[PDB]
Design a protein around this nucleic acid. Structure first.
Ligand SMILES: [K+]
Ligand SMILES: [Mg+2]
Ligand SMILES: [Mg+2]
Ligand SMILES: [Mg+2]
Ligand SMILES: [Mg+2]
Ligand SMILES: [Mg+2]
Ligand SMILES: [Mg+2]
Ligand SMILES: [Mg+2]
Ligand SMILES: [Mg+2]
Ligand SMILES: [Mg+2]
Ligand SMILES: [Mg+2]
Ligand SMILES: [Mg+2]
Ligand SMILES: [Mg+2]
Ligand SMILES: [Mg+2]
Ligand SMILES: [Mg+2]
Ligand SMILES: [Mg+2]
Ligand SMILES: [Mg+2]
Ligand SMILES: [Mg+2]
Ligand SMILES: [Mg+2]
Ligand SMILES: [Mg+2]
Ligand SMILES: [Mg+2]
Ligand SMILES: [Mg+2]
Ligand SMILES: [Mg+2]
Ligand SMILES: [Mg+2]
Ligand SMILES: [Mg+2]
Ligand SMILES: [Mg+2]
Ligand SMILES: [Mg+2]
Ligand SMILES: [Mg+2]
Ligand SMILES: [Mg+2]
Ligand SMILES: [Mg+2]
Ligand SMILES: [Mg+2]
Ligand SMILES: [Mg+2]
Ligand SMILES: [Mg+2]
Ligand SMILES: [Mg+2]
Ligand SMILES: [Mg+2]
Ligand SMILES: [Mg+2]
Ligand SMILES: [Mg+2]
Ligand SMILES: [Mg+2]
Ligand SMILES: [Mg+2]
Ligand SMILES: [Mg+2]
Ligand SMILES: [Mg+2]
Ligand SMILES: [Mg+2]
Ligand SMILES: [Mg+2]
Ligand SMILES: [Mg+2]
Ligand SMILES: [Mg+2]
Ligand SMILES: [Mg+2]
Ligand SMILES: [Mg+2]
Ligand SMILES: [Mg+2]
Ligand SMILES: [Mg+2]
Ligand SMILES: [Mg+2]
Ligand SMILES: [Mg+2]
Ligand SMILES: [Mg+2]
Ligand SMILES: [Mg+2]
Ligand SMILES: [Mg+2]
Ligand SMILES: [Mg+2]
Ligand SMILES: [Mg+2]
Ligand SMILES: [Mg+2]
Ligand SMILES: [Mg+2]
Ligand SMILES: [Mg+2]
Ligand SMILES: [Mg+2]
Ligand SMILES: [Mg+2]
Ligand SMILES: [Mg+2]
Ligand SMILES: [Mg+2]
Ligand SMILES: [Mg+2]
Ligand SMILES: [Mg+2]
Ligand SMILES: [Mg+2]
Ligand SMILES: [Mg+2]
Ligand SMILES: [Mg+2]
Ligand SMILES: [Mg+2]
Ligand SMILES: [Mg+2]
Ligand SMILES: [Mg+2]
Ligand SMILES: [Mg+2]
Ligand SMILES: [Mg+2]
Lengths: 50, 149, 126, 119, 207
RNA sequence: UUGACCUCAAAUCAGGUAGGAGUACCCGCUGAACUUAAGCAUAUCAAUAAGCGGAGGAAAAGAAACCAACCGGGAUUGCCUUAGUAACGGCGAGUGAAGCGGCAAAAGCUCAAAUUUGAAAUCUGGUACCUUCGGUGCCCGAGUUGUAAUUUGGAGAGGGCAACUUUGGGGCCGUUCCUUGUCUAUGUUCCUUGGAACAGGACGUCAUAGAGGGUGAGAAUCCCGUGUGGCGAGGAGUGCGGUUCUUUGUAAAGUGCCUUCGAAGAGUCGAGUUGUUUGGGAAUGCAGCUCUAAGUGGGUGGUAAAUUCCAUCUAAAGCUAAAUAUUGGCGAGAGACCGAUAGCGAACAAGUACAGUGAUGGAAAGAUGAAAAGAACUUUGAAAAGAGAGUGAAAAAGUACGUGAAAUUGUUGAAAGGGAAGGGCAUUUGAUCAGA
RNA sequence: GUCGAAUUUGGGUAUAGGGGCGAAAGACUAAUCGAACCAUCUAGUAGCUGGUUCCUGCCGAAGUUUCCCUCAGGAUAGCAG
RNA sequence: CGUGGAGGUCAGUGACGAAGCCUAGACCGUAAGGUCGGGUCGAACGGCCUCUAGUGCAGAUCUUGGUGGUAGUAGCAAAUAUUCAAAUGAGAACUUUGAAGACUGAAGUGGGGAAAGGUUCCACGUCAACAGCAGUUGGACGUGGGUUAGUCGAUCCUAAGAGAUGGGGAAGCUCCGUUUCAAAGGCCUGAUUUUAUGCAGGCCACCAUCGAAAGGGAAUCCGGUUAAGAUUCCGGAACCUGG
RNA sequence: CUAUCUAGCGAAACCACAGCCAAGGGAACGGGCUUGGCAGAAUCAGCGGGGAAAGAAGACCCUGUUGAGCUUGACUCUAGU
RNA sequence: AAACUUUCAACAACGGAUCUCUUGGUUCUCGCAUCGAUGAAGAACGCAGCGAAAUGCGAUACGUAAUGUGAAUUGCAGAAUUCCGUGAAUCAUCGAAUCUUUGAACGCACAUUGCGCCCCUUGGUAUUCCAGGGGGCAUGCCUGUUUGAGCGUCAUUU
């Protein structure tokens, strides 16, 4: 809203920090079932619902 | 739903009976556990026969008064006539029942006799003595069977 | 032929225990037999593999090859022996993963703890 | 390879405080360096050294307070034993072994006797 | 599981929506939404007539009928043709029943117990085991039933003075107290004619 | 004016305690309807779901105001029975116990009501010290509107007479149990196949070990284990087995005879009525309201009542292990169970992603290969890629990865084809093929 | 149509399901209203509709009787194995 | 007849190839089916005697998944409108620059905000997917940068209202009520300064708290500055509150 | 401006199998069956005769010992008073 | 005659059936009894050289201490190889600690990272203002302590 509560801003900060692709050195680990970031969020696709 | 010539049935399954169905899958496991508990209790208790001496007693209800069976405990009169006090009999392994009364001299005499037999056939260890290992027997009932007069 | 109620013959449980064994358990799991000479010299049959042990490969395509252990890759359930490698097409070299049950220890890397282990297992003259 | 707690335990609280300050200065310098240098892992050792020094300092302080409260009832609650809440609320061994005078008399007079059937 | 297939709030959409009237998962946004539920024909549904633990598992048999079957099995052990027909490679073997010395009851070591069985002629049956061992066909192999093999001789004794432990590692060989003879061992697979090696004490105690 | 007392307050007073979670099982409250009755209202579902309060490792119950009617049993609980029975019920649909008997486990008890009255003998706390789950001294305080000892109905108490019998708790070393550590057998011998031998064949070895798992394919004998024993470690605990310093105490307890007594629970029992409930039927329990006891009394004795007896217990106060329960928790062992549309919703970063304002709803998704050896290098292309080369046992395994069906599709080949196609009988022709 | 007052509208606040709210249409109460949504009871019941999975061999019907709150159902006798 | 699993047996088959799958190739059976060859493939499986069942599909507007014909079809037609050249690029109707032609026409297609969103802002790299044509461009993708306050808001006040306490109700979850049937108090200081406090002179109360980023309200402006911040930074010049 | 043709892009409804008629009989209005008429690849734009075209387990009507909203000295109750 | 259509085969597609796998589920049995104001369960936000998650943890942050084992961890980087050692490890064990903001949740509030009061202390002359650090302040109830209230009430001076 541009006048947001600190709680909201903290949640947005966490969302920004976790808005990234999978680290590439994962997928090199020994067993590594993980293929991609399946929890990736985008502002144009799925809203955080606060 | 009354079809051809069959007996009228009274199957009581109109409640949520499937919520209370006890299948005794643990019959064998419980038998094993009971035997284990009897063995552990025998080892834990003194070389004492795992059960108290019970009196002979007449069953009520003429359907069963023709037979005799083990009762709960010897009456106070029976213990006194056998020469013990109730507290000491309870400590030396005699079941004592204050509720039961003696109105039958034959049953009273049989109970006094088996109390005397038990006193003659048991060895009470001293409180602070040696009492060399006396080869625990496990069943006072088997040692002193109830005999039908 | 198991007799104790504390051991499980369940294949699912055994496989889970193997594949999720921690590093310390994997050390025991990755044991190698001693060679004939070492068995005679030490009085013991097998020992957990160690990074500086010398081994001889007795099974597989690398059979007959010898070297010193390079790493006990406990995560991979395998050991890597120096000079037992695969030369890739690009010129690089990668270690060959070997299982210690397919090797014989021809020279133990010894220290106080290893000597104590040998004596505890019933070894003579260390 | 960092500090060792058994080595720190031989030092006075002033020496430990000074070493803690030095380790914090070293960590600050290391994280200044981290911005330029790619992937230096030496920060972890200093962080664990700071943790070890703090642990030993707290061990010394808590032991001092334990000595101060030795013997007397009403020690501090974080120095009291942490069993479960129910276990802390349970009767002590003294209680729940308390018996009345009548009960003690009769249990001394007629204890469970040791006996065997011998036939 | 008694709740399998019913952990949903699915309701029938009813008619008029051009789909079958099966109950359907509500909500939206997941793919499970609108899917059929609760039906034995539905993926993720409840099976028809879910199996219950109170199915009858054990079967009561009259004690006398059980003893009749056991006596018949014991008698069949003495018929050479039945023993041959039941596997049990007794071809070059002396008179059946095969009774051996009571010294067999006191053997402590597998080596000497096996040597005694070979001497009295059970070598071919022992070798029939250890050669019939094969991976079980089907899913039973990962239900702790991985391997199958033939049955060897049943050694019957009167007093266990080591023979049971001495023989318990020999594949296919079973041991039995003559006082308690098992039908499941005397007629494995309901097939009469188990190869039975009686000790002398067990043979005398049979009467 | 001072000092009490009683009652009531305050303090961030000294020290504690409750709440919330879990909730499978357990103790209560509250409480349906779908349903069955072929309709339906009593009934049934059901004294159930949902809702609320409260525990534990079990809970609850529990040592008779019991059952009985016998030649009497003798706390409670649970199992097998009683029994689908007595009884209830639009006597319709339906429902439905209990006594006895066999068994599992067994265990018994304590307050109130008593003058210690020649001695509040009792207890919390504070403080000092100590051998600290506590002890001792001192000090306040609580308490006579009653804290100890003594008694609990089986009794028992007060006096009188006579002896006899028995005994308290700590030390140390083992045992009991708990949690753990470590050690303890026998082939990597030869040939064949294979990328790999763990396959087949030969010769052996151990077996109280041929359970199970791993390792490049079906491994007793390669590895871990398994089997059998050995050697330790840290605890809990007095349950017992020995040894020692403690010796309690002219203390406590039990027993015989005579004698005087013998306190035993009230708005409770019981009664009426109302509601609910029960198999309980002129009323089984529970609860509201009104009435409201007695003491050779009171309760019960399954048909209401008056009268006379009899039997059996002793309410209105209390504690208590085991046998019993356990879709929760922790630790284990298993299965004629399921084998990735199955089995839990979830074999996987699943109660995840995602939907909904919200309560809530809630997926899909496992498999290269023994090993990445995950394709160096060349060449065409802007590139993705292709074509080679190469790795590999296999690329008819290339991470769009085991196998790789069908629908549906491309190419190739064969054939036929005037408003469907497909089918049956028969033979021609073409193709193809077994038998002898 | 109305457009300066029974005007339009933001935000805050109140009213919650046999309840609200209604200048009243059974209207509105989150695309849901002659009783919202969510979960559970619940796999509610259905004399009614649909379906009901291998082969061959032998035998082989009934739609009629009586009774029923029965008339799309059942019991009963008959027919059949 | 066939299927999953179980006891027995054939010391059955099998990495020299089990199972599965494909096969207008062969054989047996009336049939359910069974058997063989060839291809593919890679780790198990079968005959017989019995046991057992979650055991046989064409349908259920069946369930889940997958796939067609329709069909390169319907269509991608509202909001006046595009054009020339160059640059970039493998590639330009659509990117960038220039030129031209137009439009919104200040109740904007302009410049800011509130709710909401949450990084979309800005730069660099960059086009597999997305932008129902395209794409070298982008609100995309990858990596980073960025939001500076005594004065602007919140914070404080009370509004409709919400809501503890004291009490009362309710089996209870909780309900009522908001100053009520309550012993509901801190702040002044004589004196005290054995200590500005307790004893002790004396003054005021019919009451928690929440409730507004549009109501009330202490105080800041100009110029400049960034890729992206500005009444916040920088320069200068003020003002308010508390002390 | 579409439709139309082209480049790029690219769905859906629906679909037992399909698609020429006349008459006959037939569940009494056939695309199929019978008897005749006939009948030649592959197609494009239109079109609204037919496919008893699609859309929806007819909402009218009846049946059900299926409801619900509503009403009333229906039956049986009930808050309140 | 092609094209087209249809059928079949081969190869290639599409798709993911089948088969074989299985650290998962399901059911049975056995044993055990241990959440929380000493702050639980749950939540939020953080923490690694390079992590978005899962898992772990709490500013001592994929962890500290202690004990055991006895040389790893491993995707890379880095470190070490004295590793015959109070010593590797994403090891096991676990008794000492830390344990942000919360949450029954406790100074008051909470759509605020809002607002107090007390004590000790440090700095700014500073008991009063501002700031930093440390420690505190919920409610019901119990026992006790202290200070009190009431002609409820006793005695006493009177
Ligand atoms: K209605
Ligand atoms: Mg299922
Ligand atoms: Mg199979
Ligand atoms: Mg206090
Ligand atoms: Mg609670
Ligand atoms: Mg039902
Ligand atoms: Mg009905
Ligand atoms: Mg009906
Ligand atoms: Mg009805
Ligand atoms: Mg309930
Ligand atoms: Mg508990
Ligand atoms: Mg128990
Ligand atoms: Mg209890
Ligand atoms: Mg009594
Ligand atoms: Mg009884
Ligand atoms: Mg009967
Ligand atoms: Mg009932
Ligand atoms: Mg006495
Ligand atoms: Mg071994
Ligand atoms: Mg294997
Ligand atoms: Mg009484
Ligand atoms: Mg009730
Ligand atoms: Mg009582
Ligand atoms: Mg009780
Ligand atoms: Mg699944
Ligand atoms: Mg599959
Ligand atoms: Mg909604
Ligand atoms: Mg797959
Ligand atoms: Mg292959
Ligand atoms: Mg494939
Ligand atoms: Mg096909
Ligand atoms: Mg109307
Ligand atoms: Mg059904
Ligand atoms: Mg016929
Ligand atoms: Mg019909
Ligand atoms: Mg099955
Ligand atoms: Mg094959
Ligand atoms: Mg075919
Ligand atoms: Mg394979
Ligand atoms: Mg089925
Ligand atoms: Mg089908
Ligand atoms: Mg069909
Ligand atoms: Mg369909
Ligand atoms: Mg479909
Ligand atoms: Mg078009
Ligand atoms: Mg259009
Ligand atoms: Mg336009
Ligand atoms: Mg331009
Ligand atoms: Mg205009
Ligand atoms: Mg204009
Ligand atoms: Mg931008
Ligand atoms: Mg496009
Ligand atoms: Mg494109
Ligand atoms: Mg480019
Ligand atoms: Mg971006
Ligand atoms: Mg302002
Ligand atoms: Mg309120
Ligand atoms: Mg406010
Ligand atoms: Mg304002
Ligand atoms: Mg700006
Ligand atoms: Mg300035
Ligand atoms: Mg016609
Ligand atoms: Mg006609
Ligand atoms: Mg037609
Ligand atoms: Mg014709
Ligand atoms: Mg034509
Ligand atoms: Mg038209
Ligand atoms: Mg038409
Ligand atoms: Mg219809
Ligand atoms: Mg309809
Ligand atoms: Mg009818
Ligand atoms: Mg109705
Ligand atoms: Mg905490």
């Amino acid at each position: 809203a541009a006048q947001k509560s600190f709680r909201i801003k903290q949640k947005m900060a966490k969302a920004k920090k976790q808005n990234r692709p999978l680290p590439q050195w994962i997928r090199l680990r020994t067993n590594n079932t993980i293929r991609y970031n399946a929890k990736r969020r985008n502002w144009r696709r799925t809203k955080m619902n606060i | 739903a009354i079809s051809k010539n069959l007996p009228i049935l009274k199957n009581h399954f109109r409640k949520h009976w499937q919520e209370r169905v006890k299948v005794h899958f643990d019959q064998a496991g419980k038998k094993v556990s009971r035997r284990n508990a009897r063995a552990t209790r025998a080892a834990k208790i003194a070389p004492r026969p795992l059960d108290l001496l019970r009196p002979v007693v007449r069953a009520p209800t003429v359907k069963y008064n023709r037979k005799v069976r083990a009762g709960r405990g010897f009456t106070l009169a029976e213990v006194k006539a056998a020469g013990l006090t109730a507290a000491y009999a309870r400590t030396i392994g005699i079941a004592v029942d204050h509720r039961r009364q003696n109105r039958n001299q034959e049953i009273f005499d049989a109970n006094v006799q088996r109390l005397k037999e038990y006193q003659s056939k048991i060895i009470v260890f001293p409180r602070n003595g040696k009492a060399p290992e006396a080869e625990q027997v496990l069943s006072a009932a088997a040692t002193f069977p109830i005999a039908q007069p | 032929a198991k007799q104790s109620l504390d051991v499980s013959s369940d294949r699912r449980k055994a496989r889970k225990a193997y594949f999720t064994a921690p590093s310390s358990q994997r050390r025991v799991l990755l044991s190698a037999p001693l060679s004939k000479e070492l068995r005679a010299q030490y009085g013991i049959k097998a020992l957990p593999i160690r990074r500086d042990d010398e081994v001889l490969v007795v099974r597989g395509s690398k059979k007959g090859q010898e070297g010193k252990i390079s790493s006990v890759y406990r995560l991979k359930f395998a050991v890597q022996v120096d000079k037992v490698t695969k030369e890739k097409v690009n010129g690089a070299s990668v270690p060959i993963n070997l299982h210690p049950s397919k090797l014989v220890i021809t020279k133990l890397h010894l220290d106080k703890d290893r000597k104590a282990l040998i004596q505890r297992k019933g070894g003579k003259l260390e | 390879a960092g500090v060792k707690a058994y080595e720190l335990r031989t030092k006075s609280k002033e020496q430990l405080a000074s070493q803690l300050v030095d380790l914090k200065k070293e960590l600050a310098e290391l994280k200044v360096q981290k911005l330029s240098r790619p992937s230096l892992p030496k920060i972890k050792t200093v962080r664990k050294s700071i943790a070890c020094v703090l642990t030993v300092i707290n061990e010394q302080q808590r032991e001092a307070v334990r000595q101060l409260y030795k013997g007397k009832k009403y020690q501090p609650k974080d120095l009291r034993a942490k069993k479960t809440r129910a276990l802390r609320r349970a009767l002590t061994k003294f209680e729940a072994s308390q018996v009345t005078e009548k009960q003690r008399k009769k249990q001394i007079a007629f204890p469970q006797r040791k006996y065997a059937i011998k036939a | 599981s008694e709740k399998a297939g019913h952990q949903t709030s699915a309701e029938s959409w009813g008619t008029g929506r051009a789909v079958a009237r099966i109950p359907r998962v509500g909500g939206g946004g997941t793919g499970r939404s609108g899917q059929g539920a609760f039906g034995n024909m539905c993926r993720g549904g409840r099976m028809f007539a879910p199996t219950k633990t109170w199915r009858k598992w054990n079967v009561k048999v009259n004690h006398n009928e059980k003893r009749y079957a056991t006596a018949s099995a014991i008698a069949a052990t003495a018929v050479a043709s039945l023993v041959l027909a039941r596997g049990h490679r007794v071809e070059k073997i002396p008179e059946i029943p095969l009774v051996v010395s009571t010294d067999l009851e006191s053997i402590q070591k597998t080596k000497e117990a096996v040597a005694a069985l070979k001497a009295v002629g059970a070598h071919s049956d022992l070798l029939k085991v250890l050669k019939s061992k094969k991976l079980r066909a089907g899913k039973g192999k990962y239900r702790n039933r991985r391997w199958t093999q033939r049955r060897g001789p049943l050694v019957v004794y009167a007093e266990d003075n080591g023979i049971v432990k001495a023989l318990r590692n020999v594949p296919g060989v079973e041991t039995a107290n003559v006082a308690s003879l098992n039908l499941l061992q005397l007629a494995p697979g309901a097939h009469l004619g188990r190869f039975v090696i009686w000790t002398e004490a067990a043979f005398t105690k049979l009467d």
